[PDB]
């Protein structure tokens, strides 16, 4: 059992896992969607209620047992070991879609190495529609069918989505994006090549550069006209909207997927931690850092958005129509296009995006690798590197379908599914098992023998009452809202929302499958079957 080396490595790795590439285009826009300045109170309330306790429980479970994601159940509740396979499937889908998003970002960064950025102009071969969504103009030119030049660059030069008719017509493949994702996967494999020592040593670099970049972007966008209205609308409270349950659901889900429990990542990181390590300080510091980073990212994004909205001399909230990753690659592309320093800012921003994605990819792949390794102790001689290569190959195979010309549809599908009521359900089952079958008293005693002091009554009541109930409430709210995805001029058909449902279910189905397998593997009556299933086995 190898350790983290220096204590800073574990904290930096957890922080890098916390700072997701998704929240650098989601969090400010969705904050604007609900409340804005008044969204912070539900955000922090739901954080304290359900996100921090789940982070603490995952860190404590990972540290106490020194195991991965499939053997901690053997050490806790053997009947619920299918959570490991669910985590593996979730990590596979996440790696696929997240790495093709990385491929898009890397292609953008490569195209950003020119003195004149290619997305500023509309004279290119891929600019065939309209070019009326320009900036720094005084005339009145606006039609309902216009398209921004950056939108043309994104959807017709990098994505090349104009060559596909939707999810039913996935024709062609982008070789440039293929090479970009090949380089990205090679970097990921070389980072998780040997173990966690090199992973921490590279996280020392790829997790601190994003913070410097964010600081530079914030303090250079603050000196831009029109940012005042953007930051005001970001911090304009709307207490009337806070009455409905939708804002509460949104805040709880946002904090849950920003901290990100149930992915099997924190358990792997905490497994390499010493027994005498203090989980309380690390968990609190990481949660505070994640919240502050989200706030700073929202601040700088809204500063840029308000700057360009005042430049356009038009009303605000008419530019946030681009949701998901398109927000960055369109809005920020235009922003740095109009900025004095274009190449420098574009390269810096896309490098920061690459590092943000790199931290998450390293974290998830190392978590799944540790889960596989700990499940099979007889595979510890040389299976590390070969298993890393196999996982990278499997992720490449999964991203191959998303690598097509019209792959953006399946990317936006795998982004909105397998990241909804699937990780939430996995985390809910994890918490239920740990605090109902393993016993809250036993877990508290283990944490007391770990740190030296038992957690206060706040955790002891929250873990048992609020977090499972809040996760169940989130799942119930999400299941009652039908999904209607909408990409650029494409409405998803009925079969798309069924394929997404099947994809989301395929990961979750592992837990009931293993439940039935372990129930039927041993003969006997049902009652003592569930008796021995819950009770663990001594080493």
């Amino acid at each position, epitope marked *: 059992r190898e350790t983290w080396g220096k204590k800073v490595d574990f904290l930096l790795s957890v922080i890098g896992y916390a700072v997701d590439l998704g929240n650098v285009w989601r969090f400010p826009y969705i904050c604007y969607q609900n409340g804005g300045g008044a969204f912070l109170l539900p955000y922090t309330i739901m954080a304290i209620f359900g996100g921090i306790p789940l982070f603490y429980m995952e860190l404590a479970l990972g540290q106490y047992h020194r195991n991965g994601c499939i053997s901690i159940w053997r050490k806790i509740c053997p009947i619920f070991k299918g959570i490991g396979f669910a985590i593996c499937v979730i990590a596979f889908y996440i790696a696929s879609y997240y790495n093709t998003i990385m491929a898009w970002a890397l292609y953008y960064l490569i195209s950003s190495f020119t003195d004149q950025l290619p997305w500023t102009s509309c004279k290119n071969s891929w600019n065939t529609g309209n070019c009326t969504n320009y900036f720094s103009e005084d005339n009145v030119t606006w039609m309902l069918h216009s398209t921004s030049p950056a939108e043309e660059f994104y959807t*017709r030069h990098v994505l*090349q989505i104009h060559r596909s008719k939707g999810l039913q017509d996935l024709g062609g493949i982008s070789w440039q994006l293929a090479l970009c994702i090949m380089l990205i996967f090679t970097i990921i494999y070389f980072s998780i090549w040997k173990g966690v020592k090199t992973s921490g040593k590279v996280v020392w670099v790829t997790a601190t550069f994003p913070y410097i970049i964010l600081s530079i972007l914030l303090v250079r966008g603050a000196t831009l006209p029109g940012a005042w209205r953007g930051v005001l609308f970001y911090l304009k409270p709307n207490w009337q909207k806070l009455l409905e349950t939708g804002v509460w659901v949104d805040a709880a889900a946002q904090i849950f997927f920003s901290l990100g429990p149930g992915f099997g990542v924190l358990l792997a990181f905490a497994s390499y931690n010493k027994f005498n390590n203090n989980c309380y300080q690390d968990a609190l510091v990481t949660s505070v850092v994640n919240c502050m980073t989200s706030f700073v990212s929202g601040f700088v994004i809204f500063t840029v958005l308000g700057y360009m909205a005042e430049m356009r001399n038009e009303d605000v909230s008419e530019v946030a129509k681009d949701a998901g990753p398109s927000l960055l690659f369109i809005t920020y592309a235009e922003a740095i296009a109009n900025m004095p320093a274009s190449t420098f800012f574009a390269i810096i921003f896309f490098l920061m995006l690459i590092t943000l994605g790199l931290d998450s990819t390293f974290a998830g792949l190392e978590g799944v690798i540790t889960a596989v390794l700990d499940e099979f102790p007889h595979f510890w001689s040389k299976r590390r590197e070969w298993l890393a290569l196999g996982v990278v190959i499997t992720c490449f195979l999964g991203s191959l379908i998303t690598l097509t010309f019209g792959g953006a549809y399946v990317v936006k599908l795998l982004e909105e599914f397998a990241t909804g009521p699937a990780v939430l359900t996995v985390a809910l089952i994890e918490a239920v098992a740990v605090f109902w079958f393993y016993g809250i008293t036993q877990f508290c005693s283990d944490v007391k023998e770990m740190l030296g002091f038992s957690p206060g009554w706040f955790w002891r009541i929250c873990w048992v009452a609020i977090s499972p109930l809040f996760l169940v409430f989130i799942i119930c709210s999400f299941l009652m809202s039908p999904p209607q995805l909408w990409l650029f001029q494409y409405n998803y058909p009925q079969w798309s929302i069924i394929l997404g449902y099947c994809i989301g279910t395929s990961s979750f189905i592992c837990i009931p499958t293993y439940i039935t397998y372990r129930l039927i593997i041993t003969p006997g009556t049902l009652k003592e079957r569930i008796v021995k299933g819950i009770t663990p086995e001594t080493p």
Partner: antibody, heavy 118, light 110 residues
Framework: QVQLQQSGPELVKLGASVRISCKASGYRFSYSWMNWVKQRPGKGLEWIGRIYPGDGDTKYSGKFKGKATLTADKSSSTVYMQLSSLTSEDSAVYFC??????????????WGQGTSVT | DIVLTQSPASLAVSLGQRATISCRASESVDNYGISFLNWFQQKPGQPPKLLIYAASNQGSGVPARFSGSGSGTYFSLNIHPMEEDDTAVYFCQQTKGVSWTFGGGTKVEI
């Protein structure tokens, strides 16, 4: 209704220059390439270059880059194409056409009338 | 630079017959699913007139008899039924990255 107006016929002595205009109208002048075409008497078409009035960028085909200069005035919607050190080899008819968008293949849908430069 | 060769250099097609014009490029012209090749028509003493754009779509003032085809490296333009007013020197032009060039010119007679 897209109409392109070109300058009249001109005569240039051996060792002088010329300035050929092209007044486009009827469309978005800043959002379409302006391509000049050279045609010797009895020979085939020869591409001279292109210019984008929106950004002012200019492109060329071959050795014409060192001889032909392309300028565009947005206010007057006129495109100029200067020739330096004209000789007998350039006694041709120069056309001016506007290119289309991307998926149209930058098509030369609308042409001018050609100037018989001697 | 892409070099285009026109074959045949001169065509003699009787009235009512189908004409065939072939344009071969040095490299490929497809960039984003669109064939960056266009077909022109130049009568003597008249400016060139666009016939087919994107190698498959006809122009506004082009009759349905003119049909263009060809993707990648080989492109062909067929006129059927050919009439008398088709006695013009056809051209094929590419609109690739930097330098654009014309073909050789097919003199269709009769």
């Amino acid at each position: 209704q897209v109409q392109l107006q070109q300058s009249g016929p001109e005569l240039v002595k051996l060792g002088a220059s010329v300035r050929i205009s092209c007044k486009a109208s009827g469309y978005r002048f800043s959002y379409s390439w302006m391509n000049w075409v050279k045609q010797r008497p009895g020979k085939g078409l020869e591409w001279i270059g292109r210019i984008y009035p929106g950004d002012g960028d200019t492109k060329y085909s071959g050795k014409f880059k060192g001889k032909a200069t392309l300028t565009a005035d947005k206010s007057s919607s006129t495109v100029y194409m200067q020739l330096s050190s004209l000789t007998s080899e350039d006694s041709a008819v120069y056309f001016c056409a506007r290119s289309a968008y991307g998926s149209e293949g930058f098509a030369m849908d609308y042409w001018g009338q050609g100037t018989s430069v001697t | 630079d892409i070099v285009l060769t026109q074959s045949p250099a001169s065509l003699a097609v009787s009235l009512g017959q189908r004409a065939t014009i072939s344009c071969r490029a040095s490299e490929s012209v497809d960039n984003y699913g669109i064939s960056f090749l266009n077909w022109f028509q130049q009568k003597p003493g008249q400016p060139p007139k666009l016939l087919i754009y994107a190698a498959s779509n006809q122009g506004s003032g082009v009759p349905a008899r003119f049909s263009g085809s060809g993707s990648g490296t080989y492109f062909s333009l067929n006129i059927h039924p050919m009439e008398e007013d088709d006695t013009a020197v056809y051209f094929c032009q590419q609109t690739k990255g930097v330098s654009w060039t014309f073909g050789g010119g097919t003199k269709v007679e009769i």
